[PDB]
Design a protein around this nucleic acid. Structure first.
Lengths: 141, 297, 59
RNA sequence: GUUAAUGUAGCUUAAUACAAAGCAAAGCACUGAAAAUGCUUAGAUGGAUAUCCCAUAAACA
């Protein structure tokens, strides 16, 4: 049968095949640098003077999912770009964009003051209820 | 000036690291107008609203998020997902196109609901038992980018329609009949991408016509790039939708029932065992020295 | 204990108080620049007529 | 009127694309002070095009 013909080894080209399986490499260097680089994706939250922005960024430094109150769709329904509620909305919106992108796992490393901020805590509450995980799975060796 | 918070140094340091420099660093080695005026008017109304001010100070404001999604939709962000997952490199040999038509696909499950197919979504092969629903005179092709079992560059079709009148897909010619997903076991997530190509003029794709029904992998194998190159003059892609599928019980059914082949099973191949090469005559070799080298010690 | 209406009434006046102060600060900052610009502009005017006069003034 | 300036919010040629952006800056809370920190405040294309333009303000006048 022609169909039975199959190569001895598979050829998977999906970039996230190893990452999704957990076998993808995580940066285990930078022992002299803080924080740890053992995360495939990270949540970057930038609070500007008039706007609040949240992003999910890969180790390479390229954002895959970007949620900003600068975006037209969110702001029209959002009263004030800088607000505690805005942090919740951008987190829920960021989750929905994460839902759109297919990214379910992420690593969040808030700063001491950022973690203490209730708005960021509510934003984290927005992410967990939406299902987006603030912690990624461990790598597989 | 001195940073008054750690973040100021960290943000600048993080930005500083990202930028390339003459000295060697880790990164180098390892790496319209009218609408806005209307938007501004809404901002003034939204800001002026006293009720909205009260909600903000009371931290009780809410949003109709569903509206945000529709208004946000999208071309530029849609491209990111396709490029991020490597569709462009595998499908067009690196050609990147901004999708302008908001293509959306979902795999119909039963009759109550149809399973969405997001960009980068995961859908089990069992749920894909039947063909999915896809929403001017264009074409449409289905691909198994990494579902191929023998050749890396090659890929398989699920079903290919040509000369799709306007949008209605029922009238498109069924060049390739629908096949359920058949991702090999042990290979993790296989990415399948749905492409929409603008058809400048109706052209008979006799070369791409396939027998119905066809259950042969030897004839399902194809290349998107050369197929698109042959029609690249009249083909400009505009729609994108791709999901991931793992191995599942339905996959066994697909491989055996209609594909009529043994299920492919793969795993990382380990290197051959390393064996030390002892000397036939250990001249001037004691037991204490050999003891450490040998297993016994 | 203050009532929610009392807090709402007080919340409004703080907004008015903040609005008045910020307007004053913006006006005050402009006053500093305007007088400094006029004073610097004043310096140039006499220099053209006679630089020697400022020699005593700058001391 | 001739020359010449000056016309996004303290700053920026940020931007005219998917946003009028980033940055400077503010109020209150927290009681040595400041800073840090939490919650919050006020904002602009006076205007076009791929130079006119009117307003404005100068030397010519």
């Amino acid at each position: 049968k022609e169909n039975e013909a199959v190569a001895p080894e598979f050829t998977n080209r999906n970039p996230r095949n190893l990452e999704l399986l957990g076998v993808a490499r995580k940066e285990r260097g930078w022992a002299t640098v803080w924080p740890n680089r053992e995360f495939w994706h990270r949540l970057r939250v930038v609070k500007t003077q008039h706007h609040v922005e949240a992003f999910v960024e890969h180790l390479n430094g390229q954002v895959v999912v970007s949620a900003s109150t600068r975006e037209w769709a969110i702001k029209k329904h959002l009263y004030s770009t800088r607000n505690v509620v805005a942090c919740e909305s951008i987190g829920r919106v960021l989750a929905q964009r994460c839902l759109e992108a297919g990214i379910n796992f992420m690593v969040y490393q808030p700063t001491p003051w950022e973690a203490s901020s209730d708005s960021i805590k509510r934003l984290q509450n927005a992410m967990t209820e939406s299902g987006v995980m603030l912690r990624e799975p461990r790598r597989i060796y | 000036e001195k940073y008054r918070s750690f973040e100021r140094y960290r943000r600048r340091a993080e930005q500083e690291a990202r930028a390339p420099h003459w000295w060697r660093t880790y990164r180098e080695h390892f790496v319209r107008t009218q609408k806005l005026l209307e938007r501004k008017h809404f901002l003034r109304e939204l800001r002026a609203n006293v009720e909205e001010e009260r909600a903000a100070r009371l931290r009780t404001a809410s949003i109709p998020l569903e509206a945000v999604r529709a208004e946000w939709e999208g071309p530029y962000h849609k491209q990111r997902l396709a490029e991020y997952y490597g569709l462009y490199r595998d499908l067009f040999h690196g050609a990147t196109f901004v999708p302008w038509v908001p293509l959306h696909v979902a795999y119909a499950v039963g009759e109550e609901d149809l399973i969405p197919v997001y960009h980068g979504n995961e859908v089990t092969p069992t749920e894909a038992s039947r063909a999915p629903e896809v929403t001017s005179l264009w074409t449409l092709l289905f691909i198994n980018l990494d579902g191929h079992l023998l050749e890396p560059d090659a890929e398989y079709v699920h079903w290919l329609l040509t000369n799709i009148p306007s949008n209605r897909v029922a009238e498109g010619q069924e060049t390739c009949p629908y096949l359920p997903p058949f991702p090999a076991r042990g290979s993790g997530f296989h990415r399948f991408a749905f492409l929409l190509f603008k058809q400048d003029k109706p052209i008979n794709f006799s070369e791409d016509t396939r027998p119905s029904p066809c259950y042969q992998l030897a004839q399902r194998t194809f290349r998107t790039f050369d197929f698109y190159k042959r029609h690249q003059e009249a083909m400009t892609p505009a729609g994108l939708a791709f999901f991931q599928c793992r191995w599942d019980d339905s996959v066994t059914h697909t491989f055996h029932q209609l594909l009529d082949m043994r299920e492919p099973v793969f795993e990382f191949v380990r290197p051959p065992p390393y064996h030390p090469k002892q000397k036939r005559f250990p001249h001037e070799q004691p037991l204490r020295y050999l003891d450490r080298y040998r297993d016994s010690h | 204990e203050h009532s929610p209406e009392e807090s709402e009434r007080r919340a409004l006046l703080l907004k008015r108080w903040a609005l008045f102060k910020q307007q004053e600060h913006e006006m005050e900052r402009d006053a500093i620049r305007s007088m400094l610009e006029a004073q610097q502009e004043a310096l140039e005017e006499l220099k053209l007529e006679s630089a020697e006069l400022y020699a005593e003034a700058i001391k």
